[PDB]
Design a protein around this ligand. Structure first.
Ligand SMILES: Nc1ncnc2c1ncn2[C@@H]1O[C@H](COP(=O)(O)OP(=O)(O)OP(O)(O)=S)[C@@H](O)[C@H]1O
Ligand SMILES: Nc1ncnc2c1ncn2[C@@H]1O[C@H](COP(=O)(O)OP(=O)(O)OP(O)(O)=S)[C@@H](O)[C@H]1O
Ligand SMILES: [Mg+2]
Ligand SMILES: [Mg+2]
Lengths: 461, 463, 433
């Protein structure tokens, strides 16, 4: 309490030393005096440009509120201090924010540099969105980014990108949120594609990617987690995780991993959310999520999809490829109808994305990706150069298992190669060119920059 | 708040007695003065070695952040007091600790005792790192540690040791936990190996080893134990149990003993845990246990594994523990069809197979049990216990394959320890008690006194 | 209570300043004195015309209920002040509302302008009622009403209209609930006809519509949703899905979206819906369904119409009513109870080429106008594009197939062109395939 009053007085008195010391020592930057003025506003009204600058550096809010409701920008423009107004605008001050009396800083601003600064800030705010729109669609389509992380699944990537672009440009039913369903065998990038899409939509914003694993919603009462308990009940003050996260980021990508595990009541709530487009928490607040993107992953028809894709590959080899026809989708549909038992739920789904089991070339690409990851990790951590040959890739892919997808290749690479590297690391490995070779059927290693097979550090003795 | 001010004033005055009294009363050891100095900081700047000693004894933190963001070590070094700097370093102060401006205590030190002491502490940190690395280079007994407690199962030991070594030396993806599944007959060391691995990884730390008896999760709704109840239901405030335990020790060894007893819908929750090591409790908090180790024990393919091992050993007897495609053709359809989904098995890094003991391994088990009992007798009653090879043969004759080492354990308890406990009624004294086979070869065995020429008496129960 | 007392005293004394201050401070405009009279009532009896005006502007209700139970209109009329009565009526006061003693304001009114004003308000109410009746009469022919927003299904529309007229005109068993079973494939206007029927019959917004998916109703969900989990059961969702909405609109149009997927228990409880209705709610309330409209639907009989196409081809286009009496339905749904009580069965026919192309055209028109930069919309070859689209004929699950055809062959192309910045304005279509 004393520190806050001292900071307020220092801001009023334009005391650079006191303000800096209090801010560095943990004093609340936005401490509010009983008269309604914080350090930033008292600094702005008194033309304390240095105090305003230091407060902004510490995290002061220039948009935080007769001058009732006047923010720091309002007082800075009132004081006719162009430097203070510019500094506050640099901190995110809104030149059109209205105080309790409805007066914006522009209205309080006197003709001169203050008005120009406010107009420039408003123009920058307006044109930032245009710049983002121009940059997003150019030189970096979603498909381009996805192809970096995902191997194969070209049709799925194209479908997702086309749908996303349609939503972005408005050539779509903007009255309803965009909904996807991902199907296929295991270990083929459903969750991976969803995560990459979320990252691309929201860059690095964690709040932009709401992750829900439906395996926790196998019971009827689990729906409470979406919206929280009703008033007066245990934990009602937390109105569900989903509602809070959505209101934090309306256009967040929502992933319901393994949706098939969810209890039917949960699916009913999901369908209500999709059709309505907004959800009401347990506190009576309703949150609009029309622009949100919902992605669902499951393996309900995985076996049918996989065996049909393998049959189509074999049929194409009789011509010597895999484009699954809509009739196979009609054949699959009854399975989905039986599992979900909600014909409206399936109909509400905007897109069904099918992932195919990998072909041999895609397995080779997967093995190469894993080896590259391990090689770069070794180079970074221990300055070890790792090399391999096509034969090594063939040998590793020989361990592939269709029922597990990329996970099988990952585990095979780890056990066959990485185990040897770890065993030899403590004593033999050093910076240089370590190359993997095949003797007859097993993977062997070569000495750094020399064709000498390292002696394995036989455990025990 | 007056207690904090009094403690700060006492510390700045080099008053050990007042500082101790304030600390005992309940004054915060890390109380911060309005000028940024804490009690330890003001003690250090004034060369108050006794004050620093008493503050550290109460739990003072010398690494807490122009003197902006400085540390008690910085102030002690600035005053150039060897004793105060030494005490602060002994209390956890780091000469590599950096203040707001980035200055380290080494920088503040002037040539003399303080500079040498700070260099010594920096070398202590660096050599701690290097010596941990050197030990890890030497730390290759995990196979030895296991073989101390486990007999046979060489393939399982090798697999687990290789995976653990890989994880320990880096060389492992941090985006996915490490998962094992242990398969085989009953009483062959699955749970034993899991417990030994947990002990090795976390020494004696109880929080480091998390145990779950999946036989208690035979119902779909029982999954709530992992994550707790949702908001508005009994026990919601408590939250998940497994989530709490994982929060305590993120890198703990998790053991789902007898997992095939669980309802498949309960196993369903393990998909995320095994893939990304993330679980969200009933309150919506993720635990992010990426670097934990998950071990599952089950006997689903017990009969197939045992039969295949017996057949392989019979074949090898013509003139050892390898199965290449037998796993995929035979074991996999069992595991998948009767209990699991494909995606669940896809997340398991390694499947470990335990095979039934060979005859020599049975002899080793019998010797292990006899050694355990002899150790107990010597340690407690100062009784030395001896036996012969024929004793081991007779004991192993009672071995039962369906029960594994438990059969031998019970046999030893039944046919030997019962006689030892009955002889312990004043017929056992601290001498070389010897166990021998009677004239009836492979039929009976008796105890002999400290002096071997005398057999132990009838135990005279029907008094 | 202090604010209410102050407002009441100010209204009684005609203190405009005090009334305004109390209203601006949040005092209840409809504050009720312990003796039964409110601020508006006392202002009215005292001829405080300005106080009544300001109270009404603040939201005062002049219909709030020996003068016990008298409304503000009653008190203004008793005071014989024309201005106060006019102001109260302007706010919605009813000149015929009775107090607890059964005395209307007209009875309290004395000869003068008050009589004329109260009778004018009564005439306004009567004219409103007559206007609603005339609008409902003009709603006929309901066949045209439905055809305004539906394509095809003329037979079903005519049947529904005739049944509605018969029930309205007393030529039906009005004592018994009214129930249709709708038969055919999915997505052929069943839900569209039910929704249009609800929109037209009920005044607006389909407030009286009630549609449910009987596929989610099972032994574990029958009472918890259909009747709604009553008190003392696992869950407290009384009403659940059906009777929670029937509490407001007893004459609801109620759609059950697949009886092939309905549970035997729910199909049995649905037996209450017939005879007299009065279906038990989770709260225990029962609704007389003799006036309600139930629309069961199924696809189990979807073949009976599609396989023939005679009911469509031979219905005066260029078969017979109940060509086979309940062919599959009796064996499946126990005609003795469930279908024996159904008053009528409505067939739904596969969409014709003309109907399909009309749907395509309407969807394309929507998309054209849906365009934000409509200047770029030319719709050149729209008829030909529709001809191409209908090639993917709806023979699978309903008009949603045609909607997906339109989305695939049109929307994607336009989005791609927009992304390629090839749409400045005056843009034609493209004939693919
Ligand atoms: N198409 C892919 N390209 C590159 N890596 C992939 C691909 N698919 C999977 N992976 C990797 O292998 C791992 C497998 O996990 P997922 O892709 O998310 O499983 P899935 O394909 O969705 O099938 P389920 O859900 O287990 S039945 C991922 O974490 C990826 O790192
Ligand atoms: N040296 C050893 N080698 C193998 N097993 C041992 C050894 N020493 C002790 N055990 C026994 O191993 C048993 C635990 O192993 P488990 O394989 O989990 O048996 P289990 O619990 O019956 O297995 P299942 O899965 O339930 S069939 C305990 O009875 C231990 O006493
Ligand atoms: Mg996944
Ligand atoms: Mg066990």
């Amino acid at each position: 309490s004393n520190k806050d009053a001292a900071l307020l007085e220092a801001a009023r008195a334009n005391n650079m030393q006191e303000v800096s010391r209090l801010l560095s020592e943990g004093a609340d930057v936005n401490a509010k005096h009983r008269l309604g003025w914080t350090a930033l506003m008292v600094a702005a009204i008194n033309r304390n440009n240095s105090v305003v600058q230091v407060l902004l550096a510490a995290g002061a809010d220039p948009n935080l509120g007769s001058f009732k409701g006047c923010t720091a920008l309002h007082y800075a423009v009132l004081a006719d201090d162009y430097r203070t107004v510019k500094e506050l605008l640099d901190g995110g001050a809104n030149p059109l924010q209205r105080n309790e009396m409805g007066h914006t800083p522009l209205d309080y601003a006197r003709e001169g540099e203050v008005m120009k600064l406010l107009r420039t800030s408003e123009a920058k705010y307006q044109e930032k969105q245009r710049k983002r729109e121009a940059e997003e669609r150019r030189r970096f389509p979603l498909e381009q980014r996805l192809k970096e992380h995902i191997i194969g699944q070209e049709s799925a990537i194209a479908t997702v990108g086309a749908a996303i672009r349609r939503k972005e440009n408005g050539w779509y039913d903007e009255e309803h949120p965009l909904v996807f369903l991902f199907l296929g065998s295991s270990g083929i990038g459903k969750t991976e594609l969803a995560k990459q899409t979320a990252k691309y939509m929201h860059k690095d914003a964690k709040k932009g990617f709401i992750r829900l694993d439906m395996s926790e919603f196998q019971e009827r009462h689990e729906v409470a987690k979406f919206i929280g308990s009703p008033p007066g009940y245990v934990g009602h003050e937390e109105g569900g995780q989903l509602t809070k996260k959505l209101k934090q980021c309306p256009n967040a990508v929502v992933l319901f991993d393994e949706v098939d595990k969810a209890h039917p009541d949960v699916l009913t709530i999901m369908l209500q959310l999709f059709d309505e487009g907004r959800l009401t928490d347990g506190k009576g607040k309703t949150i609009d999520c029309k622009d949100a993107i919902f992605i669902m992953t499951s393996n309900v028809a995985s076996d049918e999809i996989a065996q049909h894709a393998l049959q189509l590959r074999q049929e194409a080899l009789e011509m010597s490829i895999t484009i699954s026809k809509n009739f196979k989708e009609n054949v699959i549909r009854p399975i989905l109808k039986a599992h979900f038992r909600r014909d409206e739920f399936l109909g509400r789904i905007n897109e069904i994305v099918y992932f195919l089991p990998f072909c041999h070339s895609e397995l080779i690409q997967l093995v190469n990706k894993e080896l590259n990851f391990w090689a770069k990790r070794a180079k970074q951590r221990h300055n070890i150069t790792l090399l391999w040959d096509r034969e090594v890739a063939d040998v590793l892919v020989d361990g592939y298992n269709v029922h597990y997808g990329a996970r099988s290749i990952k585990h095979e690479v780890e056990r066959r190669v990485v185990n040897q590297l770890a065993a030899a690391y403590e004593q033999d490995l050093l910076p240089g060119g370590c190359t993997l070779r095949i003797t007859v059927e097993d993977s062997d290693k070569q000495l750094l920059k020399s064709p000498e097979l390292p002696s394995p550090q036989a455990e025990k003795r």
